[PDB]
Amino acid sequence: XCAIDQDFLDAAGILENEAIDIWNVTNGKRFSTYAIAAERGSRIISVNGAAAHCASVGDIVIIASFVTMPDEEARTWRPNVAYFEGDNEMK
Amino acid sequence: XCAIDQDFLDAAGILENEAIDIWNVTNGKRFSTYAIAAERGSRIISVNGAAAHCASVGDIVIIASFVTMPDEEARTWRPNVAYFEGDNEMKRTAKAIPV
């Protein structure tokens, strides 16, 4: 794979080559792949390879990454969330 | 399961008995299993056991392994990638491949 505008990756703290989960709001499919950077300002979300069987152009998706840490740190942890509308315009 | 030519395991940095993900480009199935080494130079990719319900002879697949490491190491990490064409002929680069 999933190529993502590098500005989107920066806002959510997702790294190139990191494991990501994709949850498709349109068709209900759920799968795991890895992140590749697309050009900054492109607003691209591209599903490449085998993943093209789980999403079509125009599907709405949620993309998430997970990390591990000790219980004591987890209690106050705050995730990085980015919100979108229209043609992949970041609020 | 999945038995893989030991040369291919070495090029990708995958160990015998390591967890692997298989993504089937031909039929879209996605599953997790573990790697077994086949004889060096055999060019075998063999799906054994329950995994034989998810792939067939001739299907095109992607085989991946994932590791954990701290954030500072993750930011400079580069994965080990091998590319294939024809009779499971391995290349270091995507340049030579038709499509």
Next chain:
Amino acid sequence: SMIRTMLQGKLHRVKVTHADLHYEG
């Protein structure tokens, strides 16, 4: 000693713009 799996980050309701079965990278 006990290690948790926590949400690191998410992109909420992005649209798929391209889909390529034949990718090589």
Next chain:
Amino acid sequence: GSMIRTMLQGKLHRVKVTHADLHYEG
């Protein structure tokens, strides 16, 4: 540095399946 990431270690890109055996013992 205690926050741990899950990263792609390596991949075999578009290898072809050569054998499939439901009845394996190993």
